[PDB]
Structure 1
């Protein structure tokens, strides 16, 4: 008959933004899982080995632009 040379696929990795704008986060809380820097680390946000953006401090998450880059900041809580 016939057969397919396809049928392989990788497991779902579950990327994407995990905390949206204004959401209160704790220090170290993961903000976005991603491959490559679609979002760059902004103020109060660190970037991990697999390009995960996480919170360096408590506060509220905001998405903005720092110079020419899309960045994610954590504004310290009032």
Structure 2
């Protein structure tokens, strides 16, 4: 015993209603715990960045929790 790995600082970075700039990282995660919505890319490691300036919006898309940007 005794081994461990570094804490990866995962989780939501910007919450609902926050004003963000284009390219802002919104959610660091493993896999698609959240799913990209309108104006939201994914990133090579499920990073859920913002493709446009606007406000964050969490929603539901038939089972999947989604994060979207409204302009």
The answer, yes or no, to whether TM exceeds 0.5 is yes
After superposing on structure 2, the runs of 4+ consecutive aligned residues of structure 1 that deviate more than 6 Å are: none
Q: 1:50 aligns with which of 45, 48, 66?
A: 45
Alpha-carbon displacement from aligned partner over 1:11-32 (angstroms, at most 9, x marks no partner) = 0100000000000000000000
* Bigger Cα displacement from structure 2, 60-69 vs 10-19: 60-69
Query: In the alignment, what sits opposite 1:20?
Result: 15
Provide the rounded CA distance (Å) in 2 between the counterparts of 1:61 and 1:11.
Answer: 29
Alpha-carbon displacement from aligned partner over 1:39-63 (angstroms, at most 9, x marks no partner) = 0000110000110000000000011
| Structure 2: gaps (5+ residues) | none
Q: Which has the larger radius of gyration?
A: 1
Alignment coverage as a number of residue pairs: 71
| Structure 1: gaps (5+ residues) | 1-5
Provide the rounded CA distance (Å) in 1 between the counterparts of 2:25 and 2:8.
Answer: 15
Normalization by structure 1: what TM-score? 0.88
The answer to whether the aligner puts 1:61 opposite 2:56 as a matched pair is yes
